[PDB]
Design a protein around this ligand. Sequence first.
Ligand SMILES: *[C@@H]1O[C@H](CO)[C@@H](O[C@@H]2O[C@H](CO)[C@@H](O[C@@H]3O[C@H](CO[C@H]4O[C@H](CO[C@H]5O[C@H](CO)[C@@H](O)[C@H](O)[C@@H]5O)[C@@H](O)[C@H](O[C@H]5O[C@H](CO)[C@@H](O)[C@H](O)[C@@H]5O)[C@@H]4O)[C@@H](O)[C@H](O[C@H]4O[C@H](CO)[C@@H](O)[C@H](O)[C@@H]4O)[C@@H]3O)[C@H](O)[C@H]2NC(C)=O)[C@H](O)[C@H]1NC(C)=O
Ligand SMILES: *[C@@H]1O[C@H](CO)[C@@H](O[C@@H]2O[C@H](CO)[C@@H](O[C@@H]3O[C@H](CO[C@H]4O[C@H](CO)[C@@H](O)[C@H](O)[C@@H]4O)[C@@H](O)[C@H](O[C@H]4O[C@H](CO)[C@@H](O)[C@H](O)[C@@H]4O)[C@@H]3O)[C@H](O)[C@H]2NC(C)=O)[C@H](O)[C@H]1NC(C)=O
Ligand code: PGW
Ligand code: PGW
Ligand SMILES: *[C@@H]1O[C@H](CO)[C@@H](O[C@@H]2O[C@H](CO)[C@@H](O[C@@H]3O[C@H](CO)[C@@H](O)[C@H](O)[C@@H]3O)[C@H](O)[C@H]2NC(C)=O)[C@H](O)[C@H]1NC(C)=O
Ligand code: PX2
Ligand code: CLR
Ligand code: CLR
Ligand code: PLM
Ligand code: PLM
Ligand code: R16
Ligand code: R16
Ligand code: R16
Ligand code: NAG
Ligand code: D10
Ligand code: D10
Ligand code: D10
Ligand code: HEX
Ligand code: HEX
Ligand code: HEX
Lengths: 88, 213, 330, 213, 215, 63, 117, 117
Amino acid sequence: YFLNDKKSFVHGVTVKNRMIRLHPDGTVLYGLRITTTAACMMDLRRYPLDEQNCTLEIESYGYTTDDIEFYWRGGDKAVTGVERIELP
Amino acid sequence: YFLNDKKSFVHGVTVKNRMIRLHPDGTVLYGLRITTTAACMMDLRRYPLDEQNCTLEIESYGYTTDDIEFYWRGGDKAVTGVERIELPQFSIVEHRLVSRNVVFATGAYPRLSLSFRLKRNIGYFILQTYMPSILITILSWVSFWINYDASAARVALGITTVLTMTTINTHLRETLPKIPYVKAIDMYLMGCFVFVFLALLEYAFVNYIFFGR
Amino acid sequence: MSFVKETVDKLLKGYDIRLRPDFGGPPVCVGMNIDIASIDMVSEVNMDYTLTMYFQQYWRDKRLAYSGIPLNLTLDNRVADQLWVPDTYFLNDKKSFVHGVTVKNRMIRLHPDGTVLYGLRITTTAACMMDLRRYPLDEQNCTLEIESYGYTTDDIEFYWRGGDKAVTGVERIELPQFSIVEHRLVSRNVVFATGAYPRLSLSFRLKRNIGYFILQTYMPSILITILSWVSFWINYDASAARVALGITTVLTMTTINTHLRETLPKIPYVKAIDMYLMGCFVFVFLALLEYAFVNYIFFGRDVNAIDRWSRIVFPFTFSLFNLVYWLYYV
Amino acid sequence: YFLNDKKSFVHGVTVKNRMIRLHPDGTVLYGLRITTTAACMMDLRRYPLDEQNCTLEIESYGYTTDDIEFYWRGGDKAVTGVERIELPQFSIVEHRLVSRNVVFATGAYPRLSLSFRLKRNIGYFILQTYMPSILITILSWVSFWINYDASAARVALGITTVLTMTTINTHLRETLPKIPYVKAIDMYLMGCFVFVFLALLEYAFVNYIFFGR
Amino acid sequence: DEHSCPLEFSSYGYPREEIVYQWKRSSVEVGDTRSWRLYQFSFVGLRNTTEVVKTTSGDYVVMSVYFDLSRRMGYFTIQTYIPCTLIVVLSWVSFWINKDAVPARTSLGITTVLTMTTLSTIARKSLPKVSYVTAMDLFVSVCFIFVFSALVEYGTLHYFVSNRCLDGKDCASFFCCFEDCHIRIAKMDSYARIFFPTAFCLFNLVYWVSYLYLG
Amino acid sequence: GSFTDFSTIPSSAFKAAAFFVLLSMVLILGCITCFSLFFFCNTATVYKICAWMQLLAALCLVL
Amino acid sequence: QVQLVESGGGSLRLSCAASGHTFNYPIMGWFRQAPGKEREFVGAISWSGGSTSYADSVKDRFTISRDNAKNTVYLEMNNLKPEDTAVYYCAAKGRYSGGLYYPTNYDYWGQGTQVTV
Amino acid sequence: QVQLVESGGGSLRLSCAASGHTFNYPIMGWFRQAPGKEREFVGAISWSGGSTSYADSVKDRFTISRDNAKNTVYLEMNNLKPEDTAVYYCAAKGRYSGGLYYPTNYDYWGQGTQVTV
Ligand SMILES: *[C@@H]1O[C@H](CO)[C@@H](O[C@@H]2O[C@H](CO)[C@@H](O[C@@H]3O[C@H](CO[C@H]4O[C@H](CO[C@H]5O[C@H](CO)[C@@H](O)[C@H](O)[C@@H]5O)[C@@H](O)[C@H](O[C@H]5O[C@H](CO)[C@@H](O)[C@H](O)[C@@H]5O)[C@@H]4O)[C@@H](O)[C@H](O[C@H]4O[C@H](CO)[C@@H](O)[C@H](O)[C@@H]4O)[C@@H]3O)[C@H](O)[C@H]2NC(C)=O)[C@H](O)[C@H]1NC(C)=O
Ligand SMILES: *[C@@H]1O[C@H](CO)[C@@H](O[C@@H]2O[C@H](CO)[C@@H](O[C@@H]3O[C@H](CO[C@H]4O[C@H](CO)[C@@H](O)[C@H](O)[C@@H]4O)[C@@H](O)[C@H](O[C@H]4O[C@H](CO)[C@@H](O)[C@H](O)[C@@H]4O)[C@@H]3O)[C@H](O)[C@H]2NC(C)=O)[C@H](O)[C@H]1NC(C)=O
Ligand SMILES: CCCCCCCC/C=C/CCCCCCCC(=O)O[C@H](COC(=O)CCCCCCCCCCCCCCC)COP(=O)(O)OC[C@@H](O)CO
Ligand SMILES: CCCCCCCC/C=C\CCCCCCCC(=O)O[C@H](COC(=O)CCCCCCCCCCCCCCC)COP(=O)(O)OC[C@@H](O)CO
Ligand SMILES: *[C@@H]1O[C@H](CO)[C@@H](O[C@@H]2O[C@H](CO)[C@@H](O[C@@H]3O[C@H](CO)[C@@H](O)[C@H](O)[C@@H]3O)[C@H](O)[C@H]2NC(C)=O)[C@H](O)[C@H]1NC(C)=O
Ligand SMILES: CCCCCCCCCCCC(=O)OC[C@H](COP(=O)([O-])O)OC(=O)CCCCCCCCCCC
Ligand SMILES: CC(C)CCC[C@@H](C)[C@H]1CC[C@H]2[C@@H]3CC=C4C[C@@H](O)CC[C@]4(C)[C@H]3CC[C@]12C
Ligand SMILES: CC(C)CCC[C@@H](C)[C@H]1CC[C@H]2[C@@H]3CC=C4C[C@@H](O)CC[C@]4(C)[C@H]3CC[C@]12C
Ligand SMILES: CCCCCCCCCCCCCCCC(=O)O
Ligand SMILES: CCCCCCCCCCCCCCCC(=O)O
Ligand SMILES: CCCCCCCCCCCCCCCC
Ligand SMILES: CCCCCCCCCCCCCCCC
Ligand SMILES: CCCCCCCCCCCCCCCC
Ligand SMILES: *[C@@H]1O[C@H](CO)[C@@H](O)[C@H](O)[C@H]1NC(C)=O
Ligand SMILES: CCCCCCCCCC
Ligand SMILES: CCCCCCCCCC
Ligand SMILES: CCCCCCCCCC
Ligand SMILES: CCCCCC
Ligand SMILES: CCCCCC
Ligand SMILES: CCCCCC
């Protein structure tokens, strides 16, 4: 789940934008297309000459580290497509 | 159910934010991530110098106190995250938890209540809404130190101060116009308007008495 | 009737819904066909457009093939859920849905040769980033991108059924502030790490209507500047008159600019209309400064040379500014 | 289904607002309570003196005229409540019911159409836009009768009339739907603006000829 | 204004011959009115009704509860009614201002017109965009006409001063004052000083009495 | 029905009748204002001014 | 309603002028009917003047323009063939009528001009 | 369309100038093709500047930047090694084209500049 989300959904046209892929070994790959509205507290005391740090926090809802352990697959190369982000 | 709720939901991405945890002694814990748009009365009579007291009332729907009894687990430690709240315009002064039984002639129903007191920050209002009105009134007072025969100058000063006051009051639509109630800012603006009006009327008296007859 | 019923039940029987047609064989081939109904409001603030259409996917499935029953069947709501359909999705959509009232606007028609036709009525809000640098003299390019979600080109191929006639109903669009100059249909194979996915693009080119802005932005600013030039012909010793004229022209320019940026979309970066308005503002400010210079030099500290120079240079400079602006931005 | 709908739903309180009724002969009556947002393209060139024709198009989705046919039960009395409808900006002058068979490549599909003709009422427009515009245009002509030597008075009057016309134009668009194309109200405002502009420009000629040289 | 907002319900499909509704006892119960979120209106009680509405599907028993609401007038008073009257008085100030102060009186009149124009927009900030005229809009329009008339009066004064049968006789002399006619235009200021307040007071009296009592 | 909302008035004849009665009201209130003008202007002139204005109000009311 | 009138009839320019409630019938279509043959869809034009649609046979030969300032549609022809000899009609279509190629969907027709080559 | 032209072939600065519809093709990437070796991605720059991406082989050595004064993108090639010899090309990529590292996703390619050292 996303601990900072205020409203999130999975796109559902034409079908539900999900995906599961299985391999000959036991591995499973699970993909979703998700739009979220995430809270980002802003320090606007220096507005408009300000710099903001926004975050997205991903966590398990009821499993501890004894049961589930997260990690970025690929390290710093895990998140892709940041160059596509453009704002006015 | 939350009595004063208008619209609430349980988050559902990637899965429903709902957990059930059992214990060997038969005990059960149920957790939910809920976003509730609860409704609280506000006394906007002293706005922007007000201090709201909003509440969340938790109540059982079907069962009475004879079947279900609500209580706060941990006494005063039941609610956490008041430090984590960060509102831009409001500032939390105190939070309270009250458990009781609403008494009906038919029976008694349990209820819990979590209340927050939210003072409003007045620096922004003192900077934007109040200070220009005071400066405009002080500018309107400038007419008394100008020569009494400077008719064009004094009349232009007074009437343009009135026009500026009206301009401020109309484009003050940011300060709660859509819902109309008499607040405190309205009284202050009305007083400043009356003062500038009297300032112009003063030169009216001066001109008629001393320049004509 | 019962013959049709039991035959349809048999067609359902023995059908694997998690498996596409010809899993080990060549890829399935899906022909897309869009019938536009309308393009609703197009937002510069959100950089998106809302589009309503009838979206049709045509393909062949030998599993759902029957002999006899010459009429082409029509599954509606329930057994339709028990058939494989492509996992097509719109890459750039922000919010979309299939219309529900009175019934789900969906249709599945099976021809006796195993062919399947799947129609949907879809409204979708799609992202359209806009180059608002020549606004309101801008020309925009919006697109709708259709792609398979999980299957690469080796499993599914997409195409435009009917070629350039695949998309119809473009003439039906009646946007108020935009005119559709051209539209195009494109098919590509975008390459990801997994492989080459199919992609279709339906592109529209939009040209904004400009008479609104000519009426309410460019004309009042020009008239206010021309009014500001009247000080040069007003007598130089008319201090109250000239000062009131100049400062009230400045006030009117600020009023126009402020209420204009209030009524217009937010657009938090520079445009062309802003440059024009700032030029007019600078012109009226310079006119007031010119009077200040006149008042200090003469009457302070046979028309005077400063006003004689102003009368000829200010209209001339404003004309050059207009020429440069219009040539640069047109 | 409604062909020109943008968003619609069936009300679901307290239960689904739906009804099935059977008759012994075999007739079936099927009722729903539907709120729908339909598209109505508008020719706002003559705004606010315009007249709109907003239609609702009812059509079968899958079936064709070889399978299903439509008709208005009760004929012209198939739609009611139109006389009871009230709107803040429009009056329903007339309503019409039509039945057609739209032709497509697949075949001819049935269609029903319910059209309303709406006439906009102009009292508030006359009160706030047309009236003060005319009055300010008239006020701009007082400079003609004001003395030619008095320059401050005439210049202030003309330029303040221009400012007031600009204020009226701007604040109008702070109320009017953006409607972004030319309209009759915009043409009238531009005409009044040009009139006050020429009235102010007249004193420029007067002052130059009879004081400057 | 006062309103009677309804809340009406019935069975959707079952006519009067199939389902019949009845109030249990004593209409409906209302909690303490202070807890209610009504800020623009004041509660003036409620009432209940039941009827048989006739529809094409059949006859249906429709129950209804009307809540009476009365608008509060303080906010609109301070926002519009007091500033408009004060601006009209400031328009009247021109008459007491000396006639020779041409820039002063002209600027005063035209800026009062501008201020009335500015105040005229805040009226419809809390109402649906309607086509007809409300009482506050009518009041603002009358005030605008008053200030316009004051400025026109000064214009006329400045122009005219800067320039320079049985039982009666003659039929016209008796029905007109064409004799002699000038002098009175100079005393136009003295006439207006008492004419304008009397007109505005008469308008206020008739307007307020009609809107409060006869309606 | 209300005078401010001409959309609700049943007919143009009703609109015209209301307009004429309103003109009569305005003219008679013009007299009740010129009762102020009795202070300064000459009595014969003010009396004739209301005589004509009341005649006009009467004609408007008859129409 | 709308009243349509066709005029005109190798640079040939036909003109279809519309009067009345032209807004309610935005799309305007040109058809041709040679002797013996039935009506065939030559072209179609929208309200705003963009998104013109021509038939396969005469896609590039003809060009259709529009100007709502006078409510007239111009059908230009560059190179004419001797199969083009026919009676040319103009018609108007509603906003939710249907397809463009079917004359039944069009409501108001014109008397139609004659062209021979 | 868009046309890309390279120029500028210790520290070597390579400037790729773009002329045309640059907005429709926001991202610009750099590729190198040594003789006998396949075309290989090196880095990429977004539309609004920043968000630079680089290949693993040339990390912390090459730094791409853009000023858009004349629609120019500068590779600013530094720490030149003998293995870093190849024909360098600048290419344009649309808003929705896919991954940066694949030449097929890039629409328009420049002429290409040679560097041999
Ligand atoms: C708001 O704006 C909208 C904008 O469109 C406007 O809409 C139009 O409204 C007018 C009425 O004012 C509609 O006109 C009517 O249409 C009737 C139906 O026409 C179709 O069907 C005709 C055949 O009959 C149908 O119905 C019978 C049963 O009644 C059924 O058996 C048939 O199978 C069929 O379904 C058909 O003829 C007609 O036209 C086609 O075919 C003829 C063939 O000769 C051809 O000439 C046409 O070119 C066309 O191809 C169409 O397909 C129609 O019956 C009706 O007729 C009236 O006049 C005739 C004589 O002219 C009388 O005989 C008859 O009794 C009627 O009095 C009339 O023409 C029009 O269709 C609307 N347009 C659209 C697109 O919906 C609204 O009116 C506006 N309203 C407001 C409130 O502002
Ligand atoms: C925002 O505003 C709301 C609305 O006013 C406040 O809500 C109230 O909070 C107060 C406390 O702050 C509550 O008062 C408390 O009730 C407790 C429980 O009452 C029990 O006892 C009664 C009588 O026997 C039973 O009927 C009931 O069912 C319960 O069993 C009391 O224990 C509290 O005690 C004080 O008074 C008693 C006398 O009654 C003394 O004996 C105690 O020693 C002590 O002095 C107190 O009376 C009140 O009920 C709440 N009202 C509502 C509607 O919730 C919020 O507190 C306020 N929030 C902020 C932050 O300001
Ligand atoms: C409920 C029933 C109604 C009751 C109310 C009844 C109202 C009663 C007043 C009537 C005034 C008109 C009466 C006829 C006036 C006749 C004239 C008269 O009386 O004498 C003159 C005025 O006297 C006077 O004080 C009269 C001065 C005018 C006073 C009127 C003020 C305006 C009244 C606003 C309307 C309020 C009432 C209605 C409200 C709904 C003064 O001569 P004087 O030679 O010295 O001058 C110098 C000259 O030579 C000029 O240089
Ligand atoms: C000494 C001081 C002097 C101060 C000045 C004194 C003058 C006072 C000011 C204005 C008077 C206004 C009179 C206007 C008369 C027109 C009244 C009218 O209603 O005309 C409508 C339009 O006409 C039509 O269709 C077509 C005809 C349109 C013509 C509309 C007239 C606008 C001009 C306005 C005149 C401005 C003043 C001019 C004074 C010089 C028709 O009804 P309709 O069902 O649609 O309404 C429903 C809607 O109002 C819902 O409430
Ligand atoms: C089930 O429906 C399909 C259509 O979804 C029927 O087949 C299609 O029928 C149409 C109409 O005949 C064919 O279109 C054209 O027909 C004319 C006839 O003169 C011909 O000249 C054209 O060249 C064209 O063929 C269409 O090609 C045909 N093909 C498809 C896509 O299925 C089918 O007959 C229906 N089955 C039954 C018996 O209900
Ligand atoms: C009216 C606009 C607002 C005016 C506000 C009040 C300002 C003062 C108005 C005084 C009007 C008046 O009494 O006019 C008298 C003069 C006499 O001039 P002359 O013939 O002695 O040179 O007459 C003239 O100068 C000639 C007549 C000029 C007025 C013509 C108006 C025509 C309007 C109808 C459309 C043609
Ligand atoms: C001081 C004196 C001169 C003021 C005169 C004000 C008069 C002329 C004003 C006040 C109230 C006004 C009316 C108020 C409401 C409406 C309804 C609208 O749909 C048409 C205009 C109409 C009918 C107005 C006409 C002008 C009117 C009668
Ligand atoms: C001072 C003199 C010259 C003119 C005064 C005229 C005044 C009193 C007139 C002008 C317009 C009039 C209003 C016009 C319309 C209505 C609506 C009606 O439902 C009640 C009366 C009411 C509210 C009128 C009250 C009186 C009124 C305000
Ligand atoms: C809405 C129109 C208002 C018109 C205002 C007219 C103001 C001037 C009236 C002058 C009256 C006195 C002089 C009349 C001279 C004459 O007509 O002969
Ligand atoms: C809100 C009140 C406005 C003013 C009302 C004034 C009414 C009285 C009219 C006085 C007219 C005579 C003034 C001059 C008298 C003198 O000669 O000193
Ligand atoms: C809330 C109590 C009822 C409403 C009271 C409104 C008072 C408005 C007074 C405005 C002044 C009118 C008379 C002015 C006379 C010069
Ligand atoms: C519930 C209170 C509503 C406000 C009622 C008006 C209060 C008085 C406002 C100030 C009036 C000033 C009039 C100008 C002359 C002193
Ligand atoms: C509701 C606004 C009331 C405004 C009152 C302003 C003060 C009026 C004082 C009276 C001025 C005239 C006195 C002299 C008359 C001869
Ligand atoms: C409301 O309904 C009840 C029950 O039917 C009835 O007794 C009562 O008279 C009605 N009216 C009021 C005002 O309560
Ligand atoms: C704020 C009012 C105007 C201040 C006048 C200052 C007077 C200085 C007297 C020496
Ligand atoms: C607006 C009221 C102005 C009054 C001027 C002075 C009256 C006479 C004082 C003796
Ligand atoms: C810029 C507008 C001012 C025009 C003044 C023209 C004066 C002409 C004198 C013959
Ligand atoms: C920004 C434009 C300035 C023009 C100066 C004449
Ligand atoms: C575009 C017209 C400009 C005129 C400047 C004098
Ligand atoms: C809008 C054109 C006005 C022309 C006035 C002479």
